[PDB]
Symmetry: C3
Subunit: 332 residues, 3 copies
């Protein structure tokens, strides 16, 4: 009887940060209660000032990472305030039935709903809006995130030994399709209905105009670079709700990678780059061995360095000259 289970309310945080949780479950199964408020908002996505009408869960692109354990129940209160204009819903790839919840969560502006589902499979999973007839438009306007369902005994390596992370980050990668005129400049629009056919035309090109981490070019850089220390074990969850990506840590590796995100499978070891298919979340575990700046990229390097799919880690600590050294510095 679900009513006899503990309830715990989670307060979500903005990506790339992740709400506090325990890797190894410290309680039995629980109903884990989340609330998200949909926000349609203008977002500047590049250094040129290109502004789009984003559709968000909780104000961010991506939406926040939710974290539960296997066989917990996820109870989500989804709020669509009357300041929004569109119908929205939510589909969890972690859930079973009713189009992942989408069939049960259609909320007009001024409405809310509560969905409960049992998290029966461990892994990282995409969630996204998916209103009938409008699915890719909502998803490619930012309106996707991820949920991590941890095994109750935490992560394990390929031999069944524990893998415990010290830090976790969530990198949502977003493909945008900003409509272009025949000279190639972006268009804007006066209403969502007036934008819709050219959004469809732009999407049909299958060529994103921007591919960004955490909602904008450069979002994971400078003061907002990811951080770690030498010797820290870091889990990076990476999702892409619509298009393949190939993450790579420049100067590092994925020591243990679940490229398609499902923890019942043994991880792939020692990866340089891995393929996360569109519509999937993946997770990579790495122990830093060197300080300095790293770039975390989609290793289509055009996508990374021209379209925006690049962020930075700043890592503190001691340099290891055994691992790498300049024997002769550049010189004439």
């Amino acid at each position: 009887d679900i009513s006899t289970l503990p309830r715990v309310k989670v307060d979500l945080v903005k990506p790339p940060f992740v709400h506090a949780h325990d890797q190894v479950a410290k309680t039995g199964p629980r109903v884990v209660e989340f609330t998200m408020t949909i926000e349609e908002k203008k977002l500047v996505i590049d250094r040129e000032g290109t502004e789009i009408h984003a559709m968000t869960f909780n104000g961010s692109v991506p939406g926040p990472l939710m974290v539960v354990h296997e066989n917990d129940y996820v109870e989500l209160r989804l709020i669509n305030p009357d300041t929004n204009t569109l119908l929205h819903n939510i589909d969890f790839h972690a859930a079973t039935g009713a189009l992942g919840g989408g069939a049960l969560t259609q909320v007009n502006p001024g409405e809310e709903t509560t969905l409960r589902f049992k998290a029966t499979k461990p892994g990282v999973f995409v969630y996204h809006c998916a209103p009938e007839g409008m699915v890719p438009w909502h998803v490619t306007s930012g309106m996707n995130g991820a949920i991590m369902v941890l095994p109750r005994d935490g992560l394990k390596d390929e031999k069944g030994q524990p893998l415990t992370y010290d830090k976790i980050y969530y990198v949502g990668e977003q493909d945008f399709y900003v409509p272009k005129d025949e000279a190639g400049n972006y268009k804007k629009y006066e209403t969502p209905g007036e934008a819709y056919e050219d959004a469809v035309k732009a999407m049909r090109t299958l060529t994103p105009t921007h591919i960004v981490f955490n909602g904008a070019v450069g979002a994971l850089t400078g003061d907002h670079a990811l951080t770690a220390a030498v010797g820290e074990r870091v889990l990076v969850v990476h999702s892409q709700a619509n298009r393949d990506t190939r993450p790579h840590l420049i100067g590092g590796h994925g020591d243990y990678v679940w490229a398609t995100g499902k923890f019942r499978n043994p991880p792939d070891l020692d990866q340089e780059t891995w393929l996360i298919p569109g519509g999937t979340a993946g997770a990579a575990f790495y122990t830093f061995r060197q300080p300095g700046v790293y770039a975390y990229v989609n290793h289509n390097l055009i996508e990374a360095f021209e379209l925006g799919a690049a962020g930075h880690f700043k890592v503190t600590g001691e340099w290891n000259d055994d691992l790498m050294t300049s024997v002769v510095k550049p010189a004439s």
Copy 2:
């Protein structure tokens, strides 16, 4: 001596259905005899009435699924009737030598040929036409299918335990490249030779105009939706002869997935989405747990919902409120 082996004649069926077979081999190795007749035909591929000149094995896009067991011999009689205009052949990715058979099976209109090969590797494999100098044109005109080579003791899970499906479906996904003029409308053509250079130009864009299951937008919907019941174990074989795809069952999972289709490998567990590379067939096994409508899609959602790569399952049975429920239905 192959002449001492039993022969069995298979009568093929139209996708997404699959000819009757046994999962666990009930006989020793056999020569399994198949016949396919090539048909060049007009096909309407979308709701707008866009009509192409399709090139088919057995009248369908995809061609039918052939099913044998490991170390059977596949004997195919391939017929190119004189009502066709082009040279065709067949290449089996399951076979070894002679470009998969393509070098031995070149048939002008009015010709036939018989090829035999030993199915030495278990898995699902693409087959496709591949005439020298014209390969992608034939393949992207529909002229591909798949063959399943079952292990003699049937499918097994990651622990070596049997996996037995109750139903099997074959979803062939087809990328079409319908030539467009500079305003973006499709062109038609008066002969294959007159179409060829613009087919090549259209293909060179690397941007399909349509991506469909079972030969047309909506083919696997309505009266032709896939069906199952709660508790049924379903195997979905999915092929793509030319371009990557990322299947996903909306509201479900791939409980056991051979993404690259080869049964000697342990399956990946609990997949949300999986990557089937172009030129591969994959297979996913799922036990339905909830009734209702599911969408089975390529989870590039633009490809699914704008270009055609979406079908439906209709599932009968009892709803499980433990797995999912609406706690509070959408309301003001």
Copy 3:
């Protein structure tokens, strides 16, 4: 103390050939010394005579395959002669720290540098140039290769048994983005600086104009076809520094494949086609069973047969009619 280790100087060879090495390490850890000289040069990449300004390591696209064992040190002397015009560097995906070495290896024309790093992870890995602000331009101008870090006890299969190759080839696959005018003809340019913005524009299309093996359409054909004999065990290392590929041996298989290239993982068995993500090297092992011509392709068949991503094997030996035969040759 690294100075107490043996040093061995390797003399590199042009792809697709690979410098001599031992699969099982015959010495303890060593410092393996390599030298590469950067060459900017004109290269004709297609049958039409399209000529680009290539950026190369050691005069070739791809750069040469380097081979070491796990826990060897790689010491590379990188020379940028004063006959070049651009700044270059090198990033090894095999290395840890300093952006794979790129932060330590920036060489103006007329400069050289020496980098040492410990090869701590076994596998095949990409290396590429990556000058800050110019990364995809250099990589997509050819300026990438691979390094193989063998386990000290050589390759092993999924059961831990040895896999020993008789021959090894390195296929580098290169995506080029040759700028096109509005009629679709290639442009040329008078200086690298004058080419840069249109190179960026061309790259931003995400649509390669050419995808080639060993630097040009047809490079691995005719007198330069790959060769083998029936019964030979062949390892094909395949890299793609920027874009996904899906190799396939037409008429054969990948008997053992490390699609993402890392030897600590068990190989995938019996592959028809496999996905090597952009920014990765993979490796496939096959034992030839039939003589004749094979095509080795990227199985996006448009990429293979229209854009250039196809080569040939010529295999000598005895035909096996048990594996494949023409029962009835094509006839009326």
